[PDB]
Design a protein around this ligand. Sequence first.
Ligand SMILES: OC[C@H]1O[C@@H](O[C@H]2[C@H](O)[C@@H](O)[C@@H](O)O[C@@H]2CO)[C@H](O)[C@@H](O)[C@H]1O
Ligand SMILES: OC[C@H]1O[C@@H](O[C@H]2[C@H](O)[C@@H](O)[C@@H](O)O[C@@H]2CO)[C@H](O)[C@@H](O)[C@H]1O
Length: 147
Amino acid sequence: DIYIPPEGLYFRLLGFASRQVIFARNSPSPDVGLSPVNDQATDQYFSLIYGTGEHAGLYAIKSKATGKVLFSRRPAEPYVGQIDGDGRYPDNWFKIEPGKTYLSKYFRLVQPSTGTALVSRTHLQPYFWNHPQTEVFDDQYFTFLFE
Ligand SMILES: OC[C@H]1O[C@@H](O[C@H]2[C@H](O)[C@@H](O)[C@@H](O)O[C@@H]2CO)[C@H](O)[C@@H](O)[C@H]1O
Ligand SMILES: OC[C@H]1O[C@@H](O[C@H]2[C@H](O)[C@@H](O)[C@@H](O)O[C@@H]2CO)[C@H](O)[C@@H](O)[C@H]1O
């Protein structure tokens, strides 16, 4: 019962471990990362693109500020970022994987073909990153924050 929004409805992605939201911006560098929940800046907002055909069941994550979609990959560095193209690459496509107990209202964002999960944390850099999906930590959990 994690609500997943339709296309066109905007949200921010809050991390359980970091209490911050993902940003995707034009400038300054870096162009992706984490920023303060309280700011509610446009570059914290995203909407989903629903995958079809080979990406049926997966979602791309499109920035309101830049129009680009998030990627999560290995082994090419850097491991996370944004790019043009509305999900033209396999690493733009995420599975939403709900947690349990205290994470029942959160989920991982797993990019299945590279086998990575997004990370949002405060204890180690990079603060916004990814991790092999097979090894689970609390800081891979996110929740949609809507207006
Ligand atoms: O979904 C991301 C795609 O990235 C492409 O690599 C980009 C790269 O991130 C950027 O820094 C710059 O160097 O241009 C590259 C070419 O667009 C990959 O080629 C593609 O496979 C995806 O990882
Ligand atoms: O879920 C993320 C986990 O990352 C682990 O740290 C990684 C780090 O992100 C990577 O860059 C490299 O240095 O290897 C580390 C070990 O796998 C943290 O140790 C773990 O606490 C999580 O944050």
